[PDB]
Design a protein around this motif. Structure first.
Motif, mmCIF file in Angstrom:
data_model
loop_
_atom_site.group_PDB
_atom_site.id
_atom_site.type_symbol
_atom_site.label_atom_id
_atom_site.label_comp_id
_atom_site.label_asym_id
_atom_site.label_seq_id
_atom_site.Cartn_x
_atom_site.Cartn_y
_atom_site.Cartn_z
ATOM 1 N N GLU A 158 -4.294 11.786 2.199
ATOM 2 C CA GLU A 158 -4.009 10.382 2.458
ATOM 3 C C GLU A 158 -2.535 10.068 2.246
ATOM 4 O OE1 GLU A 158 -6.515 7.744 0.317
ATOM 5 O OE2 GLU A 158 -5.485 5.930 0.999
ATOM 6 N N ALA A 159 -1.929 10.629 1.201
ATOM 7 C CA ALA A 159 -0.521 10.375 0.933
ATOM 8 C C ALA A 159 0.383 11.033 1.960
ATOM 9 C CB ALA A 159 -0.157 10.856 -0.466
ATOM 10 N N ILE A 179 1.089 4.273 -2.949
ATOM 11 C CA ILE A 179 1.041 5.706 -2.682
ATOM 12 C C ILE A 179 2.174 6.407 -3.415
ATOM 13 C CG2 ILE A 179 1.328 7.430 -0.846
ATOM 14 C CD1 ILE A 179 -1.421 6.219 -0.923
ATOM 15 N N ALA A 236 -0.008 8.694 5.138
ATOM 16 C CA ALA A 236 0.510 7.340 4.982
ATOM 17 C C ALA A 236 2.020 7.312 5.113
ATOM 18 C CB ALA A 236 0.081 6.766 3.636
ATOM 19 N N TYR A 261 0.820 -1.205 0.000
ATOM 20 C CA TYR A 261 0.000 0.000 0.000
ATOM 21 C C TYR A 261 0.857 1.260 0.000
ATOM 22 C CZ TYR A 261 -3.111 3.557 1.945
ATOM 23 O OH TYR A 261 -3.794 4.716 2.205
ATOM 24 N N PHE A 289 -6.390 12.990 -2.248
ATOM 25 C CA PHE A 289 -5.347 11.974 -2.254
ATOM 26 C C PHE A 289 -4.120 12.400 -1.468
ATOM 27 C CE2 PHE A 289 -1.509 10.217 -4.225
ATOM 28 C CZ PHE A 289 -1.689 8.904 -3.891
#
Lengths: 670, 335
Positions: free
Chosen positions: B45-46, B21, B49, B17, B42
C-alpha cells in the motif's frame, strides 16, 4: 480438491497429503502388463473410465507431459445450425426421456418456446424414476430460463414491440400467460439445488453453479487477469512462450461451449454468456495481430508461426457469428487487420453460410414468420453474412447467399442501405461472376417494378441507395448492359412519378436505345440530379447553368440558417451538397470567385474554402476517413493545411485504436 | 487510459492520507521494531500510494514528510536506489520542486557520500538509475546550485579512498569551484583508453584540441591498421572501440580537426556523421537510433544533408515491423 485438472489434459496434485490415486491410474493406462492384475467385477468398471477420460480429454500428468494438441469437437446440432435436421428430429417419435430433453432444447433454439415450455413440462411429469435428477434438475432450470425468455419477450413484444416489429404481435396468447405466470410465481431458482435429494448433491455438485452466475466466475476472473497479461506482453516484447495466455483462454472458451451445448442447457442464450465469448474472442484476435507481425529471431518462428489464436477455424467463425453484434465486429476491423488473418476450414464454413441463407427463405418467403425465432436468429444471420467477407466461397454457395441478402432478408432489421454494405464485403475474397451480377440485376428490376407510386421511397440509413447496387456492377464489368431495364424504359410518361428518378440513377447499365430515349423524354433541371449525374458519369464540365445553381443553393442556405438560428433549428450538412461543393472548390472544379462571401455556413465547408481563416479546433478527425486517394494528394501539396492537421493525427495515433489514422499519416502527409 | 486526463478532488484530504503513510514508514525504520506481518501488506500500500501521488497536488509542508520517508526511511529490499528516483521524479510532475525539498535531496547525496568510506559498497540497482540522476534532478529544477556539504567532503580526499572517487565525480556539477579543482587533481590521462574512459562514461569534458589531436592520431593509425585488416580479410576492427563516439562528438562539434575526412571509413560506423552526402545508405542499419540519445535525435531534426534519407529509413521498419518504440521516434524528435 485433490488435484488440479488443467485445461490441456495434465494433472498437478494439490491438497493431497494422502495416497495418490490418479498417479496410479495413468500408470495403469499405458502399461498393459499391470492391467489384468485386477478382479473381474472391477474390470468392466475400468472400461468405462478409459472411455470417459478419452472423451473429456484427460491425459497423463505433468511429469510424463506429452505434447498435447489443440482440437475441439462439439457434436450438437444446435451449435452447427442444422435447422432442417432438428425439425425432422422434433417431428419424430421419441424413444427415451433423454430424447425428450433434446427436443425441448431443439424447439427452444427454433424459437418455438410455447411448445418447449410445454415439452419441458412433460419431462418434469415423466422424470419420476430416480435413476438420476440430472434429467429433472436440468429441466427445471431450462424451463425457468424459457419463462425468463418469454417474460422479457412479452415485455418487448406487447410493450416496445409495436413500432420496431411492424405490428402489435401476440405470439403468446393471454391464455398462455395466464398459465405461465401463476406456475412460475413462487419458484425460487436459488432453492432448486438445495431442495433436491442428497443422492443428487455430492454426486452432482458441479451443476449447482447453473442456477446463477458462478459457472462463469472462475473463467471471468481468468479472462480479466490474462487480458492484462497479454496487453502487458504486447507492449514489452514477449511473445507466446509455451503454455501461454492464448491457449488457456481458448480451451476454457471451448469447454464452456461444449458443456453447455452437449448437455443442452439453455444458458447458451444468456446475455452474460454472449459477453464471455465476445471478450474471449476479441482478446485472441488482438493477440493474433501481434503474433502475425514478426520481429524477433528464430526462437519465435518455431514457437508459434500462426497457431493458438493466430489461425482461424470453423468453430471460431461460428462463435463470432453468433455471439457478436455488428458494432462488436466493427471494433475489431480497425483495431485488428482481419484481412491479414488466415481463415481455414473454408469448406465447412461454406456449409454454415449456406444453411443460414436457406433458413431465411424457409422463414421469410413462406407463411409462418415465427416472430419469436426471428428475434434470436436474425442477429446470427446478420453477423455471419457480415463476417463472411474473409472466407473464399465457391460459386454454387455464394449464389444462395447473395440471393438471400438481396431478396429474402427482412427489411425491418436490414434496410436497403445495409444490403450494399454486405454485398460489397462479399467482393473481397471474391469477384462478381456472371452468375452473381444476374442476381443483382434481378433485384434492380424488382424495385423498378415497385417504383410506380410516388409514395414509395427508399429509407437508407447509410445514404447508400438502390443505385449503388448497379454501381457495384459497373466497378468490375464496364462492358455490361441490362436487359429488363432497357424494356421498362419503353413506358415513359407522366403516369408513374417514381419511375422518373430511379431509372435516371442507373444510366451506364442501360443500352444505346434506352439511354437516348430517356434523354429525349427528360433532361436535368436540379442539382440533386447533378449529384446523381456524377455517380452515373453524366456531366464532366459543368455548364454555367450549374455554377449559377451551385451558389444559388448556397444563397438559399444563407437564407436558411439565419432565420433558423432564431428558431433554434439547423440544416448543418443535411444532404452534404455544400460539403461536396467544398471538395469541388478545393479540387478547383469551380472557377467562381464569389464563395469568399459564403464562408461561415458549416465547419466542413469553412475548412475547404478558407483554411487560413478556419480555426482548426472545430475540425472533426472522422472526416479524413471519407476522402479518396486524389483528395489527400492535394492536401499533401498544400502548406496551409499540411503542418497543422498532423497534430490532429498525432493525437489520434496514440489515443485511438483505429489503425486507419496511421495509414493516412504515413502514406500521404509525411 | 491516460490518467493525467483525470481530475482529482479532495486533495486537502488525499494529502493527509499521504502524510500518514509517511509516518508509519518513519515509525518502523527510525524504530528497530519491524512487525514483519504488517510489513507484508502495508508496504504494498505504501509503495502504490507514493507511486500514485503523481496525480495529486501537494503542499510544501506536506511534501517534506513524503520525500523524507521515500528517500531515507523506505526499506531497500523494496525500493532500491533506481526505483526511488522513479518515484521522486513522479512527485515533481504536478509539484514543482521547492527549496525545502532541494535541501532533502541534497541530504540524500551527502548520506550516500558518507556510505562509501568502504571500498566494498555497490548501489544494487535494477533500473539503470543511480545517485548521479538525483544530482541531475536538482540541476533540472535549480541550475545555480552549489552543495556546500558535498564540497566539504570531496576536498578532504586522498588517493587511498577509491570508492568515493568514482562516486563524487558522478555528482560533478553540484560541487564548488574549489571542490572541482581539487577533485580533478586526482585523476589524469595515461593512454588512449584514458583519453575517453572518464568522458564517454564519466563526462570529464576535457574539450581541448590537443586532446583531440591524439584522438585523430589514433584513428589515423587505425586507418593504417584497417589496411592491414583488409589484407587479412576482416576489414572490421574491434567492436568494443568507440566507433559510434567518432562522429557523434564530431557532428556535435567536440572534434574540430580538419583531417577527419582524410581517414574516412574506419570500420563500419565512421562515414555516417563525417560525410552524410557521400554516404551509402544501403549499408546503414537504422536500428542504431536506439543507441542515440534525445539531443542527437534533436540534432538530426535540422540535418538537411540526410533529411530525405532519415525519414524513409525509419519508416522501413515502422511500416513493416511491430516496433512500438521506433514509432515514437517519428512522433518525437522527428518532423
Amino acid at each position: 480438491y485433490d488435484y488440479h485438472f488443467e485445461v490441456n489434459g495434465t494433472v498437478v496434485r494439490h491438497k493431497n497429503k494422502g495416497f495418490g490415486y490418479m498417479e496410479r491410474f495413468f500408470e495403469l493406462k499405458e502399461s498393459c502388463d499391470e492391467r489384468s492384475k485386477l478382479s473381474k467385477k472391477q474390470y468392466e468398471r475400468f472400461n468405462a473410465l478409459f472411455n470417459f477420460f478419452e472423451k473429456n480429454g484427460v491425459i497423463c500428468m505433468a511429469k510424463d507431459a506429452g505434447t498435447l494438441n489443440t482440437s475441439i469437437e462439439i457434436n450438437s446440432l444446435a451449435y452447427h445450425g442444422k435447422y432442417d435436421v432438428m425439425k425432422k428430429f422434433i417431428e419424430e417419435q421419441s424413444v427415451s426421456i433423454e430424447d425428450d430433453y433434446k427436443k425441448a432444447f431443439f424447439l427452444a433454439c427454433l424459437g418455438r418456446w410455447e411448445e418447449s415450455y410445454d415439452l419441458y413440462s412433460n419431462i418434469i411429469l415423466n422424470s419420476i424414476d430416480e435413476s438420476n435428477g440430472c434429467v429433472y434438475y436440468l429441466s427445471q432450470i431450462n424451463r425457468y430460463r424459457i419463462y425468463q425468455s418469454i417474460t422479457q419477450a412479452v415485455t418487448q413484444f406487447n410493450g416496445l414491440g409495436l413500432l420496431t416489429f411492424g405490428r402489435h404481435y401476440k405470439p403468446f396468447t393471454d391464455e398462455f400467460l395466464a398459465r405461465i405466470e401463476r406456475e412460475m410465481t413462487n419458484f425460487n431458482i436459488d432453492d432448486l439445488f438445495n431442495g433436491m435429494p442428497f443422492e443428487f448433491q455430492k454426486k452432482y455438485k458441479i451443476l449447482e453453479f447453473l442456477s446463477d452466475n458462478q459457472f462463469l466466475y472462475d473463467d471471468t476472473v481468468k479472462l480479466f487477469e490474462l487480458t492484462n497479461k497479454v496487453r502487458s506482453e504486447m507492449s514489452e516484447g514477449s511473445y507466446s512462450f509455451g503454455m501461454s495466455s492464448d491457449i488457456v483462454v481458448l480451451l476454457r472458451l471451448y469447454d464452456n461451449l461444449r458443456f453447455l451445448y452437449e448437455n443442452c442447457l439453455w444458458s447458451v442464450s444468456f446475455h452474460e454468456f454472449h459477453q464471455y465469448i465476445r471478450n474471449s474472442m476479441s482478446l485472441l484476435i488482438e493477440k493474433a495481430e501481434y503474433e502475425r507481425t514478426r520481429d524477433i529471431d528464430e526462437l519465435g518462428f518455431s514457437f508459434f508461426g500462426k497457431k493458438s489464436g493466430f489461425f482461424m477455424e470453423y468453430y471460431d467463425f461460428v462463435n463470432i457469428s453468433r455471439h457478436f453484434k455488428i458494432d462488436d465486429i466493427k471494433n475489431l476491423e480497425r483495431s485488428c487487420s482481419i484481412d491479414k488473418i488466415r481463415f481455414g476450414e473454408q469448406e465447412k464454413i461454406e456449409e454454415y453460410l449456406v444453411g443460414i441463407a436457406e433458413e431465411i427463405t424457409k422463414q421469410f418467403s413462406a407463411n409462418g414468420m415465427n416472430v419469436v425465432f426471428y428475434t434470436q436468429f436474425i442477429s446470427e444471420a446478420k453477423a455471419a453474412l457480415y463476417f463472411a467477407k474473409y472466407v473464399k466461397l465457391s460459386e454454387e454457395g455464394l449464389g444462395k447467399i447473395v440471393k438471400a441478402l438481396l431478396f429474402y432478408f427482412p427489411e425491418r432489421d436490414l434496410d436497403i442501405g445495409k444490403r450494399y454494405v454486405w454485398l460489397e464485403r462479399l467482393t473481397k475474397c471474391n469477384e462478381l461472376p456472371k452468375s452473381i451480377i444476374s442476381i443483382i440485376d434481378d433485384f434492380l428490376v424488382l424495385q423498378a417494378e415497385k417504383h410506380i407510386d410516388q409514395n414509395y421511397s427508399e429509407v437508407s440509413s447509410n445514404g447508400l441507395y438502390s443505385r449503388d447496387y448497379g454501381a457495384l456492377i459497373k466497378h468490375f464489368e464496364k462492358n455490361f448492359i441490362s436487359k429488363r431495364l432497357s424494356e421498362i424504359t419503353l413506358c415513359l410518361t407522366q403516369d408513374k412519378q417514381k419511375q422518373i428518378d430511379f431509372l435516371f440513377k442507373l444510366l451506364p447499365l442501360l443500352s444505346t436505345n434506352a439511354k437516348s430515349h430517356l434523354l429525349s423524354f427528360k433532361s436535368v433541371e436540379n442539382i440533386n440530379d447533378l449529384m446523381n449525374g456524377i455517380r452515373i458519369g453524366l456531366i464532366d464540365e459543368f455548364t454555367p447553368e450549374h455554377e449559377e445553381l451551385i451558389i444559388e443553393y448556397l444563397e438559399t442556405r444563407k437564407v436558411n440558417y439565419i432565420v433558423e438560428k432564431e428558431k433554434g433549428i439547423q440544416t448543418f450538412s443535411s444532404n452534404d451538397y455544400m460539403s461536396t461543393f467544398g471538395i469541388w472548390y478545393f479540387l478547383e472544379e469551380i472557377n467562381n470567385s464569389k464563395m469568399e462571401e459564403f464562408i461561415g455556413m458549416d465547419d466542413q465547408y469553412d475548412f475547404f474554402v478558407d483554411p487560413e481563416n478556419f480555426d482548426y479546433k472545430k475540425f472533426i478527425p472522422s472526416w479524413l476517413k471519407n476522402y479518396n486517394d486524389k483528395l489527400l494528394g492535394k492536401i499533401a501539396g498544400n502548406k496551409h493545411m499540411k503542418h497543422h492537421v498532423i497534430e490532429v493525427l498525432k493525437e489520434r495515433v496514440k489515443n485511438s485504436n483505429d489503425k486507419r489514422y496511421l495509414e493516412i499519416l504515413m502514406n500521404y502527409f509525411i
